[PDB]
Amino acid sequence: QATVNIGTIGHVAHGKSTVVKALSGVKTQKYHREAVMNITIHLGYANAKVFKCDKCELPAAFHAFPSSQPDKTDCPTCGSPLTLKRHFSFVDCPGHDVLMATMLNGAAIMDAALLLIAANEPFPQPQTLEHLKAVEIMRLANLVILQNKIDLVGEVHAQDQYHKIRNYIDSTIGSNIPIIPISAQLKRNIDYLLEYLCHIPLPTRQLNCPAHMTVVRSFDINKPGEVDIENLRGGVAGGTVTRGIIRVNQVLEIRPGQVHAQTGGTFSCTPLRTRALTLKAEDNSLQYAVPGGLIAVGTTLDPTLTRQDKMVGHMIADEGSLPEVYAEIEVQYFLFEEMVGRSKQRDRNAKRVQKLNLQETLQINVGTLTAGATVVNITKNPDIAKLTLVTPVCCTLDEHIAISRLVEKNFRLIGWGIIRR
Amino acid sequence: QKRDIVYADPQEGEEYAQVKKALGNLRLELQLADGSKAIGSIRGAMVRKVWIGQGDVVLVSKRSFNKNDIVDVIHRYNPAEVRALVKDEVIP
Amino acid sequence: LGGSTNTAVPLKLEMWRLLVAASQLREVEFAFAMEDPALKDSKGASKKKDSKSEYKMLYGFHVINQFVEREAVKGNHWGQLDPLRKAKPDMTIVEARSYLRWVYLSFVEMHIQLKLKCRVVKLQLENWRAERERARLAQESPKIALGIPLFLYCHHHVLAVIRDEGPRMSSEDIDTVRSALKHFDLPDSYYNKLDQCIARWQNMTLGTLLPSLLPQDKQLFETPEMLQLIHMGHLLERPFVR
Amino acid sequence: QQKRSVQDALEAQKVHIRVQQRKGKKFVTSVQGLNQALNFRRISREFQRRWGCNGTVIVTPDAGTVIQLQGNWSEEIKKFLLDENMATEQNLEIHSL
Amino acid sequence: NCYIRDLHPLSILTADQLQRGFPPDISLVPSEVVSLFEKMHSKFNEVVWPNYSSLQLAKTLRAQLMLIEPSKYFEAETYITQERARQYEAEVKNAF
Amino acid sequence: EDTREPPQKILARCMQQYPDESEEVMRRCIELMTTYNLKEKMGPLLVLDGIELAEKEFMAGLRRHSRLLKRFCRVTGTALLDAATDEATKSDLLRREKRLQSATIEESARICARRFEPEQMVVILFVLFIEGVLKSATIEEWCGDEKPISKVDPAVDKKMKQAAAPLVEWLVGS
Amino acid sequence: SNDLYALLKRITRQEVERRMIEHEQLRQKQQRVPQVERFLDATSKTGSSGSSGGGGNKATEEGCGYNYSVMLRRLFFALNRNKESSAMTERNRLPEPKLEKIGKKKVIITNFGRICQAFNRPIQDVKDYIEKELSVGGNLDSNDALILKYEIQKSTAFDNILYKYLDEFVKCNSCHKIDTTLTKEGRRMELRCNWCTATRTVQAVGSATYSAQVGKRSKARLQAM
Ligand SMILES: Nc1nc2c(ncn2[C@@H]2O[C@H](COP(=O)(O)OP(=O)(O)NP(=O)(O)O)[C@@H](O)[C@H]2O)c(=O)[nH]1
Ligand SMILES: [Mg+2]
Ligand SMILES: [Zn+2]
């Protein structure tokens, strides 16, 4: 399985799923996606293994397809056998306006991302910048900046662009991240790219602490299976592991569990006890799941819902291990000065954020949650809001929250918060 | 007979321009192939001997005594000559 | 690209240049040119007074706020080279006010055309670069024919200043000197001397101006073109007295 | 919340305008794709009064609450629905010309 | 085709160059004078030269020639040649 | 206020320790204050401030923590020019240089008020202009000095006069 | 050059004086500092191997990637030395449709066949789109000259219709360029580019929402008897 999770950010029309298409060789669909045209809408996943090409740094020409390059067990570029280094997964986080909240949902899963910019547009759009501040909530260190299109326009405008971007970065986020040319519907200059990914180090994770999993996918029932045993070919809690080893035939608790309606004004939610049937990651089947990588943990019991993902921000652990369920979270919030995602003329001309006040529609993006909230209290201590959540959230950490508000039929990052609890 | 095509003299008024929409009382709305928006007129030897439609291209004149009063259609270019003009090197 | 807009502007620039004694100002009469420097001088004064370090176009009806610096700061005169050189020495007497205005407007002219010229330089530049790159292939990248217009224009442009204030240095002066540096590398000490001169001319507002931001080489075909072997050795159109 | 937001900002709501010709140089025009909630009588009766026209509030099977007008108007049947949250600027078909 | 060919110095006989030097026409640049100057410079030094590190006829002429060229070198603040050009021209033709 | 005093201290300490080890890189700091606005923000207010870097070491440690103080004190900093619009982006920048440079002279006399000598105020202001930390008007660095502090009020009318004549006297070229 | 000390009145006056002689010392000092500082950044000398190779990532950032991309983009021989000079902004050449006014009702378009060939799409499908927009009858057949019941004053203003078709169907939104070729992928999925091979899908008209009524009657009912 994958060891390291690599996401993708960038405004739409600068490529997202395009770079992924180059490497993996696969695409994502849901039918609806076609009908609106070049909106990705939900999230990508794919897997491409790393194996070092041993006389490759930047040779002049080879086949456009990446199978001469890694994701093969033999090399024709150096003409010698290959050797494993790494293995990656991919994730694709949207770049369209509306899709902010679902980018947030998939923003705490990842262990790095690629920023994508293109030469065919202006310097820094609004949505790009907003992506970046979104990251800094969950505080990724590694980041890589790219120019998707460099061969569609000249080798003049390219340079300028690069100089401007170069200036702007390492004056926001240090480390002086590199800015790199690529092509990826012409599928060239992967070798370059890949070399920079190789050097990105092993992260550390805990493999012996109580189980914790973050779910973002569900549904795999049928069509077919149709005949015989009859239906279906039960479901999943398809997501990442951060802590512990999820082995087969362990007993799992879903800690939001089945949501039950209010009985007058107070709601209750009861956990769902479920067993691991099988661990499936890629086309291979695992007997144990190591932290990192998307593992389709096979679930059991009853029908109804969890059609495409109604497991939005759900946490799975082991029996007798309970991340504490909170209906009310005391959020200590800090706001930004600029309402990013606004489009007027230029990004730098942006409008300023309005203060957080009583009785307003929020959101609250606690990790992978998208729970609706209304401010009931601004008072407890200054700059603390006691916010009541309709959809319950489970704390495993102190939680790093991005706060989104509606600006005009769409939410736009306003600030960040941390739960005191 | 004679030529069906003439060229602008940049001095003594006269600059190419294109009709936009038409307006009542013999006047029309007219726009410059470099400058900003304008209103035109027409001369009395073309008051219904010649019809200047919308998006037809023409040749103005300009007033000598005082600029930025109003301008006037003193000629018309037949569609045959418009394509030719626009090709060669000349107008946008 | 393109490049039609670029030709459409010189039309305009020819107009505005001639509108200015078409009619806007006549204000007061010269009256023989009292002197050329006096212009610069009392522009210096008026711009200092109410400063954004821009003045010019904005709030376009500053034509009033001479009245301020007239009735207050009323003398015996401040910037008094004028009254001295006149006889009768007018001070708050109406003529003086007219003079001041006539300066302000005649300068707004210079500036508002200068802008356009800067744009022209940029559009001259870009198509010459794109040209060069295409012929880089050859690795001797010719030719000197197409960019003599760039250079000759930047001369024209620059030497519009003896009269002028410092324009915005950020866009303008930079966009000139980098079409003489970044995209025409040349021997230094031509460079050094030239930038000193430009500071001199400019001054009466500001000296410095060191335009050192992003010189870059993908361009080095020159010397066999040298520095005056593209003047003596390749000019046909070549400035004349007036 | 977000769900509804998307399901609305990216699905359905698509706003048809069309122009045709009755004869010689006479013309006609329609609108379709406007929500049922809005009073059609109030929009039609505006268009009319702002220029010699002639409306209607026709209801046709599986296409209904469709309104037409007299004259060629395309520009102003787009313009008036732009500033007014009636067409997300994305759903604007013109079949004119 | 073509065929349109140029011309230049031309015939001016060594005795016509002696006597009349230089009778009009004169110049037209580009490249024209500059070429000639390159020639004179190199050809003068290139003789080695086998006497005439004395007598002071040499160092006179050589010095005077060297003093021609700073016009070519240092003339232009921008890309301008003011009319200062043809003083360079009158120099080189009086020299020759 | 927030009932979370501590990280405002760790802010200061991480701007002692990151310099100590390596003086080579100071980049991270630009994202450090983005997280940790809990007091009253501002760049050189909280970057000149430290622990023993900004107290006992202050004099020499100014010129031994140079680079990051040229990144915050001198400008907010951008490279922008346009042959399109760029008139209103003039004053956008200028207001934020205005506010910046000025109130860093508040911070100057607030460090020289735990390091009291009227003279040692004079010292620091020149060691700013000598380096790339400041290079702008001595108008700012005299007229601003008299008196920007009321956070420490009571050095007022003595430290005022000693803010210094040599500032003015080098200014005009006399 | 420049000293640092615990300055006092007298020592302050020294610094003042030194500057006043020439302002070169301070100026050129802080010209020299950023030189070696910026060298040290870009080629890297930073501690810890991962950030050392992070500024070595930075080192190979500096035109190196773009350089390999030069020779690459020249080696394809389809981004260089072609009709891109004008084909860039689509400045392509399209036959100028040419018309006839027959009967002062119908408009026959002679050049139909030639036009359809040029952007490499078939006959019936192109015809459909045109005739749908204008909401008229007429057919093609014949000697491949179209017929339409739409009446206009004779013009070059037929072009607007064609523009709509060409910017929906054929013209890719990657580069701006028609060499394009239609495909059959899944259901209601089509279109491919091939001059950079950035695939794009599009959908095909099947109108049937609202057409109004026009415009004689009696005859209508009579035929629909
Ligand atoms: N010529 C060229 N085309 C490119 C390049 N990168 C992407 N494309 C094209 O751009 C299209 C958009 O791809 P896609 O990745 O879906 O864009 P996206 O930004 O991911 N969509 P979304 O914003 O919704 O995520 C693809 O058809 C691809 O062919 C590039 O570098 N060059
Ligand atoms: Mg996509
Ligand atoms: Zn293409």
Quick one: DSSP state of residue D93?
B
Judge: C232–E85 Cβ closer than 8 Å, yes or no: yes
Is residue C76 within 8 A of residue C90, CB to CB? The reply is: no
Give the pair of three-digit tokens for residue F14. 């991480």
Amino acid at E26: I
Instruction: Find all residues with CB under 8 Å of B47, minimum gap 6, and list them.
Output: B26
Contact between residue D34 and residue D93 where contact means Cβ atoms under 8 Å apart: no
Beta carbon pairs, A and G, within 8 Å: 67
Residue E82, helix vs strand vs coil? coil
3-state helix/strand/coil string of G76-127: CCCCCCCCHHHHCECCCCCCCCCEEEECCCEEEECCHHHHHHHCCCCCHHHH
Pairing mode of beta strands A4-9, A84-92: parallel
| Whether A155 contacts G69, CB under 8 Å | yes
Q: Give the C-alpha distances (Å, rounded to integers) separating D24 from B21, F168, G104, G107, G152.
A: 19, 86, 9, 13, 8
Cα separation, C150 vs C155, whole angstroms: 9
| Chains D and A in direct contact, meaning 3 or more beta-carbon pairs closer than 8 angstroms | yes
d(CA D93, CA D31): 10
Please tell me if the CB atom of residue A153 comes closer than 6 angstroms to any atom of ligand 1.
no
Residues near D19 by beta carbon (within 8 Å), at least 6 away in sequence: D27, D28, D29, D72, D73, D74, D94, D95, D96, D97
Residue G152 to residue B55: CA distance in whole angstroms = 14
With contact defined as beta carbons under 8 Å apart, do A52 and A69 qualify? no
Supply E75's token pair.
């003339």
Give the integer Cα–Cα distance in Å for D70 and D52: 8
Q: Which two tokens stand for residue D89?
A: 């600027």
> Does the Cβ of A181 fall within 6 Å of ligand 1?
no
Contacts of residue F30 in chain A, CB cutoff 8 Å? Answer: 171-174
Mode of pairing for the β-strands spanning A113-117 and A4-9: parallel
Terminal CA-CA length for chain A: 35
Task: Order the strands of the A113-117 sheet from edge to edge.
Answer: A44-51, A84-92, A4-9, A113-117, A144-147, A179-181
Q: Which long-range contacts (CB under 8 A, 24 or more apart) does A194-198 make?
A: A194/A50, A194/A69, A194/A70, A195/A57, A196/A144, A196/G57, A197/A6, A197/A50, A197/A88, A197/A144, A198/A50, A198/A52, A198/A85, A198/A86
User: Which of these, C108, C7, C116, lies nearest to C54 by C-alpha position?
Assistant: C108
3-state secondary structure chain A: CCCEEEEEECCCCCCCHHHHHHHHCCCCCCCHHHHHCCCCCCCEEEEEEEECCCCCCCCCCCCCCCCCCCCCCECCCCCCECCEEEEEEEEECCCCCCCHHHHHHCCCCCCCEEEEECCCCCCCCHHHHHHHHHHHHHCCCCCEEEECCCCCCCCCHHHHHHHHHHHHCCCCCCCCCCEEECCCCCCCCHHHHHHHHHCCCCCCCECCCCCEEEECCCCCCCCCCCCCCCCCCCCEEEEEEEECCEECCCEEEEEEEEEECCCCCCCEEEEEEEECCCEEECCEEECEECCCCEEEEECCCCCCCCCCCCCCCEEEEECCCCCEEEEEEEEEEEECCECCCCCCCCHHHCCECCCCCCCCEECCEECCCCCCEEEEECCCCCCEEEEEEEEEEEECCCCEEEEEEECCCCEEEEEEEEECC
Task: Give the C-alpha separation, E86 to C232, whole Å.
Answer: 10
Closest by Cα among D96, D47, D42 to D68: D47
Distances (CA, A) of F169 to A231, A291, C16, F101, G9: 93, 68, 48, 21, 13
Return the percent helix, strand and coil in chain G, to nearest 5.
Answer: 40, 5, 55
| CA F64-F68-F70 angle, 5° bins | 95
Of G133, G151, G157, the CB nearest to D95: G133
Q: G175 to chain A nearest CA, in Å?
A: 7
Number of cross-chain residue pairs from C and E with Cβ atoms under 8 Å apart: 50
For tokens 């060191």, the residue is C210
C89-126 burial code (b ≥16 CB/10 A, e <16): ebbeeeebbbbbbbbbebbbbbbebbbebbbbbebbbb
Residue type, G186: G
Q: Is the peptide bond before E55 cis (omega within 30 degrees of 0)?
A: yes
Tokens standing for residue F99: 């506010």
CB C194 within 8 A of CB C200: no
G116 marked among binding-site residues: no
E43 three-state secondary structure: helix
Question: Cβ of A175 under 8 Å from any chain G Cβ?
Answer: yes
Q: Are C76 and C91 in contact (CB under 8 A)?
A: yes
Say how far apart CA F145 and CA A315 lie, in whole Å: 58
Q: At what angle do helices C94-136 and C148-158 cross, to 10 degrees?
A: 160
How does strand A288-289 pair with strand A246-247?
A: antiparallel
| D19 neighbors D26 (Cβ within 8 angstroms) | no
Q: How far is it, in rounded angstroms, from Cα A292 to Cα A7? A: 13
Helix (H) or strand (E) holding B20: strand B16-22
Q: How far apart are CA C13 and CA G90, in angstroms?
A: 31
Contact C231 E79 (CB under 8 A): yes
Sign (positive or negative) of CA dihedral G73, G74, G78, G84:
positive
Contact A75, A81 (CB under 8 A): yes
Pairing of strands B37-40, B28-32: antiparallel
Q: Which two tokens stand for residue G195?
A: 């001059």
What six digits make up the tokens of D92?
Answer: 């604007």
Helices and strands (H and E) in chain D: how many: 3, 3
End-to-end CA distance of chain C: 37
Q: Residue G55's closest CA among G63, G67, G47, G65?
A: G47
Q: Indicate the length of chain D as a whole number.
A: 97
Residue A26 CA to its chain's centroid (Å): 18
Chain G residues with beta carbon closer than 8 angstroms to that of F127: 4, 7
- Resolution of the coordinates in A? 3.3
Q: What is the CA radius of gyration of chain F?
A: 17
State the chains in contact with E (3 or more Cβ–Cβ pairs under 8 Å). C
3-state secondary structure of D22: strand
DSSP tally for chain F: helices H, then strands E: 10, 0
E39 phi, psi to nearest 5 deg: -60, -65
Scan for tokens 């060594």, then name that residue. Answer: E14
Taking alpha carbons only, the member of F31, F6, F143 closest to residue F47 is: F31
Name the token pair of G122.
């078939």
Q: Both tokens of residue C179?
A: 């079409």
> What letter does residue B42 receive in the DSSP assignment?
B
The Cα–Cα gap between G190 and G193 comes to 11
Going edge to edge, which strands form the sheet with G106-109? Answer: G99-102, G106-109, G146-148
Burial code of A327-351, b = ≥16 C-beta within 10 A, e = fewer? eebbbbbbbbebbbbbeeebbeebe
Written as six digits, the tokens of E14 are: 């060594």
Type of residue numbered G35: Q
DSSP one-letter code for C77: P
* G196 annotated as ligand-binding: no
3-state secondary structure of C196: helix
- Which chain C residues contact residue E72 at CB under 8 A? 228, 232
What does residue A347 show for φ and ψ, rounded to 5 degrees?
-55, -40
Residue pair A19/A114 in contact (Cβ under 8 Å)? The answer is: yes
β A361-362/A288-289 pair status: unpaired
Experimental technique, in short, is: cryo-EM
Cβ neighbour number for residue F160 with a 10 Å cutoff: 12
* Dist CA A33 CA A14 (whole Å): 17
How close, in Å, is residue G180 to chain D by CA atoms?
25
Q: Which residues pair with A259 in a beta bridge?
A: A269
Cβ–Cβ under 8 Å, residues A75 and A63: no
In this complex, is the C-beta atom of B68 within 8 Å of any C-beta atom belonging to chain C?
Answer: no
Is there a contact between G103 and G148 (Cβ–Cβ < 8 Å)? no
Longest dimension (CA), chain E: 55
Provide the token pair at F127: 């060691």
Q: How far is CA B10 from CA B7, B60, B61, C167, G60, in A?
A: 9, 11, 10, 32, 56
Phi and psi at residue F20, to the nearest 5°? -50, -65
Owner of token pair 């509606």: A406
> Would you call B18 helix, strand, or coil by DSSP?
strand
What angle in degrees, to the nearest 10, is found between the helix axes of A157-168 and G64-75? 160
Nearest to E31 among C158, C227, C233 (CB): C233
Spatial distance between the Cα atoms of G96 and G109, rounded to a whole number of angstroms: 11
Distances (CA, A) of B7 to B72, B73, F33, G84: 17, 14, 67, 33
Omega prior to C40 cis, within 30 of 0: no
Residue G197 Rama label (left phi>0; alpha psi -120 to 50; beta): left
Question: Which residues are within 5 Å of ligand 2 (an ion), measured at CB?
Answer: A 16-17, 40
Beta-carbon separation of B83 and G155 below 8 A: no
In angstroms, rounded to a whole number, what is the distance separating the alpha carbons of residues C211 and F139? 26
Are the beta carbons of A281 and A287 closer than 8 angstroms? no
Contact at CB, G210 and D16, closer than 8 angstroms = yes
Please, which residues have CB less than 5 A from ligand 3, an ion?
G 172, 174-175, 177, 193, 195-196
